Amino acid sequence: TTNSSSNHLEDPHYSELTNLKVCIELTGLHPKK
Amino acid sequence: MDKAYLDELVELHRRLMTLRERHILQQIVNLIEETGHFHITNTTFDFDLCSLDKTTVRKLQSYLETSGTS
Q1: C-alpha distance from residue A31 to each of A28, B21, B26 (Å)
Q2: What region does A5 belong to: left with phi over 0, alpha with psi -120 to 50, or beta?
Q3: Contact yes or no for B45 and A4 at CB 8 A
Q4: What are phi and psi of A8, to 5 degrees?
Q5: What are the extents of the domains in chain B?
Q6: Which of A22, A25, A29, A32 to mutate against chain B (most B CBs within 10 Å)?
Q7: How many of the other CB atoms lie within 10 Å of CB of B30?
Q8: Which residues in chain B have their CB less than 8 angstroms from residue A1's CB?
Q9: Cα–Cα distances in Å, from B47 out to A19, A32, B9, B29, B35?
Q10: CB A4 within 8 A of CB B37
Q11: Which family does the record assign (chain A)?
């Protein structure tokens, strides 16, 4: 793939905090090959 | 505009910190790779849930809809 998109530009709203965001540390899952 | 929905993802989103199964997590991370909507940085997969539609929420829920070592 190289082009698809599905979301861009939104009315003035939302915020930085409180927006349900995830963060999966890849430091745990690091199986050799 | 459905607090119920967001309030629904609030569980996984949080519990996601308790989940460490390198199997399930690594398998889910492969999903967001298809929708094409995330940001790679350092060594953590950062992506927003409210950014994706519902059709994806019911999908990512797949792993959460049936655990038990898959």
Answers
A1: 9, 12, 10
A2: left
A3: no
A4: -170, 135
A5: 1-70
A6: A22
A7: 9
A8: 36
A9: 11, 25, 13, 10, 11
A10: no
A11: Belongs to the BCOR family.
